[PDB]
Design an enzyme around this catalytic site. Structure first.
Site, PDB file in Angstrom:
ATOM      1  N   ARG A  49      -1.972  -1.787   2.369  1.00 44.74           N
ATOM      2  CA  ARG A  49      -2.107  -0.591   0.846  1.00 44.74           C
ATOM      3  C   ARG A  49      -2.801   0.138   0.409  1.00 44.74           C
ATOM      4  NH1 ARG A  49      -4.914  -2.769  -4.329  1.00 44.74           N
ATOM      5  NH2 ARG A  49      -3.634  -1.445  -5.912  1.00 44.74           N
ATOM      6  N   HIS A  53      -1.712   3.965   0.056  1.00 46.93           N
ATOM      7  CA  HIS A  53      -2.459   4.602  -1.397  1.00 46.93           C
ATOM      8  C   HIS A  53      -2.479   6.292  -1.040  1.00 46.93           C
ATOM      9  CE1 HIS A  53      -2.680   1.453  -5.105  1.00 46.93           C
ATOM     10  NE2 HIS A  53      -1.246   1.726  -4.893  1.00 46.93           N
ATOM     11  N   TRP A 192       4.790 -11.930  -3.509  1.00 45.61           N
ATOM     12  CA  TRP A 192       5.721 -12.598  -3.784  1.00 45.61           C
ATOM     13  C   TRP A 192       6.423 -13.462  -3.002  1.00 45.61           C
ATOM     14  CZ3 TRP A 192       1.991  -8.591  -2.828  1.00 45.61           C
ATOM     15  CH2 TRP A 192       2.124  -7.249  -4.309  1.00 45.61           C
TER      16      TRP A 192
HETATM   17  C1  HEM Z   1       7.513   1.692  -6.992  1.00 44.16           C
HETATM   18  C2  HEM Z   1       6.581   1.440  -5.163  1.00 44.16           C
HETATM   19  C3  HEM Z   1       5.404   0.395  -5.892  1.00 44.16           C
HETATM   20  C4  HEM Z   1       4.367   0.360  -6.746  1.00 44.16           C
HETATM   21  C5  HEM Z   1       4.724   0.293  -7.977  1.00 44.16           C
HETATM   22  C6  HEM Z   1       4.084  -1.072  -6.037  1.00 44.16           C
HETATM   23  C7  HEM Z   1       3.034  -1.782  -7.097  1.00 44.16           C
HETATM   24  C8  HEM Z   1       2.350  -2.658  -5.989  1.00 44.16           C
HETATM   25  C9  HEM Z   1       0.973  -2.878  -7.170  1.00 44.16           C
HETATM   26  C10 HEM Z   1       0.717  -3.443  -8.340  1.00 44.16           C
HETATM   27  C11 HEM Z   1       0.207  -3.872  -6.538  1.00 44.16           C
HETATM   28  C12 HEM Z   1      -1.245  -5.374  -7.024  1.00 44.16           C
HETATM   29  C13 HEM Z   1      -2.051  -4.511  -6.030  1.00 44.16           C
HETATM   30  C14 HEM Z   1      -3.352  -5.927  -6.439  1.00 44.16           C
HETATM   31  O1  HEM Z   1      -3.367  -5.877  -7.276  1.00 44.16           O
HETATM   32  O2  HEM Z   1      -4.301  -6.020  -5.828  1.00 44.16           O
HETATM   33  C15 HEM Z   1       0.935  -3.978  -4.888  1.00 44.16           C
HETATM   34  C16 HEM Z   1       0.038  -4.432  -3.980  1.00 44.16           C
HETATM   35  C17 HEM Z   1       0.127  -4.057  -2.496  1.00 44.16           C
HETATM   36  N1  HEM Z   1       1.048  -3.045  -2.152  1.00 44.16           N
HETATM   37 FE1  HEM Z   1       2.787  -2.279  -3.758  1.00 44.16          FE
HETATM   38  N2  HEM Z   1       3.767  -0.965  -4.513  1.00 44.16           N
HETATM   39  C18 HEM Z   1       4.884   0.082  -4.757  1.00 44.16           C
HETATM   40  C19 HEM Z   1       5.063   0.677  -2.864  1.00 44.16           C
HETATM   41  C20 HEM Z   1       4.164   0.181  -1.927  1.00 44.16           C
HETATM   42  C21 HEM Z   1       4.297   0.620  -0.572  1.00 44.16           C
HETATM   43  C22 HEM Z   1       4.875   1.705  -0.347  1.00 44.16           C
HETATM   44  C23 HEM Z   1       3.714   0.065   0.435  1.00 44.16           C
HETATM   45  C24 HEM Z   1       3.653  -0.278   1.350  1.00 44.16           C
HETATM   46  C25 HEM Z   1       4.131   1.242   2.300  1.00 44.16           C
HETATM   47  C26 HEM Z   1       2.855  -1.397  -0.162  1.00 44.16           C
HETATM   48  C27 HEM Z   1       2.100  -2.548   0.048  1.00 44.16           C
HETATM   49  C28 HEM Z   1       1.267  -2.942  -1.057  1.00 44.16           C
HETATM   50  C29 HEM Z   1       0.771  -4.031  -0.099  1.00 44.16           C
HETATM   51  C30 HEM Z   1       0.351  -4.942   0.681  1.00 44.16           C
HETATM   52  C31 HEM Z   1       0.051  -5.361  -1.301  1.00 44.16           C
HETATM   53  C32 HEM Z   1      -0.462  -6.511  -1.550  1.00 44.16           C
HETATM   54  C33 HEM Z   1      -2.193  -5.699  -1.149  1.00 44.16           C
HETATM   55  C34 HEM Z   1      -3.537  -7.023  -1.582  1.00 44.16           C
HETATM   56  O3  HEM Z   1      -2.416  -8.583  -0.887  1.00 44.16           O
HETATM   57  O4  HEM Z   1      -4.828  -6.823  -1.439  1.00 44.16           O
HETATM   58  N3  HEM Z   1       3.387  -1.041  -1.625  1.00 44.16           N
HETATM   59  N4  HEM Z   1       1.551  -2.974  -5.408  1.00 44.16           N
END
Ligand code: HEM
Length: 295
Positions: A49, A53, A192
């Protein structure tokens, strides 16, 4: 006036594939070491992530933002509310950057994600070096990263700014098989899927097989929840509400080798958006995993 800037990649002084492979290993060896993080999920998902970002701030219209400058090390980008929780991924890479002070911030931030994907049994991701640190005045403002409470029309229009098409959008979105949402970070709570630290196609399978019900979390936000305990953000669920996204979701759920191919292409394209690689630049590196090296 205001023409798109050009960020030319410059390989670090006297550094070759072997030098960056040692940075990969130091990241990979520390991944299996600090396994207690986030209820034994590991720093794997938080590093993926972080790489997304620091790259998702790119704007193709003026070539601002992106992973080139490594501007996440500055207070404006570091304290972006969209980046809440990513400071854990930053602190993980701090002792690694001390061991390898020659590597740039943008290179280390993006390599951390590439390492985490491969070390979690994901696809090979080619990685190019040459990102150069830029001053603090080049830090992009907050608000370029996407919101989670939106629909497919927003998802499609947001990623158009990153030069991603429908196939690249759905593939990149499959990374949500890793990790979980934390209420203290984003106002959403829950994972998820079940394998929070194994890079598979479980994201698309759960999107099609679970019975999702729109509910309200403790932060007053609404998220899709299933009886298995999983959750989907509204932007996640928009991939099956949209008929053009749905056909690609059903495709990755029925073929993980295909999803691995399209993710590797889109994820590298994301990490290299806005970077100009000259004619003499070295070829992309495919780093060997710790398993492939016997380490
Ligand atoms: C419209 C696109 C996306 C939205 C709205 C979105 C939104 C989010 C949100 C709100 C979280 C919660 C993080 C937290 O609460 O700690 C998250 C986690 C995460 N996102 Fe996304 N994301 C998007 C696209 C992506 C992409 C493109 C990637 C990687 C190429 C990605 C990888 C991850 C990962 C690995 C997590 C887990 C973080 C953790 O467990 O510490 N996401 N995302």
């Amino acid at each position: 006036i205001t023409t798109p800037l050009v960020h030319v990649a410059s390989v670090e002084k006297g550094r070759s594939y072997e030098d960056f492979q040692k940075v990969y290993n130091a990241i990979a060896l520390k991944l299996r070491e600090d396994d207690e993080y986030d209820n034994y999920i590991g720093y794997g998902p938080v590093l993926v992530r972080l790489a997304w970002h620091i790259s998702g701030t790119w704007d193709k219209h003026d070539n601002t933002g992106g992973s080139y400058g490594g501007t996440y090390r500055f207070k404006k980008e570091f304290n972006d509310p969209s980046n809440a929780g990513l400071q854990n991924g930053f602190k993980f890479l701090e002792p690694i950057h001390k061991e390898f002070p020659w590597i740039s911030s943008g290179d280390l931030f993006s390599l951390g994600g590439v390492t985490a994907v491969q070390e979690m049994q994901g696809p090979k991701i080619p990685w190019r070096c040459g990102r150069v640190d830029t001053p603090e005045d080049t830090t992009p403002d907050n608000g370029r990263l996407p919101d989670a409470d939106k629909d497919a029309g927003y998802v499609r229009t947001f990623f158009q700014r990153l030069n991603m098409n429908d196939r690249e959008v759905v593939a990149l979105m499959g990374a949500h098989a890793l990790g979980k949402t934390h209420l203290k970070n984003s106002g959403y709570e829950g994972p998820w899927g079940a394998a929070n630290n194994v890079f598979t196609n479980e994201f698309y399978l759960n999107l099609l097989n679970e019975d999702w019900k729109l509910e309200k979390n403790d932060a007053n936000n609404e998220q899709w929840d299933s009886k298995s305990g999983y959750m989907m953000l509204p932007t996640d669920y928009s991939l099956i509400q949209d008929p053009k996204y749905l056909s690609i979701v059903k495709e990755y759920a029925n073929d993980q080798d295909k999803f691995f191919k399209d993710f590797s292409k889109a994820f590298e394209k994301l990490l290299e958006n806005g970077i100009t690689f000259p004619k003499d630049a070295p070829s992309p590196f495919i780093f060997k995993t710790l398993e492939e090296q016997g380490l």
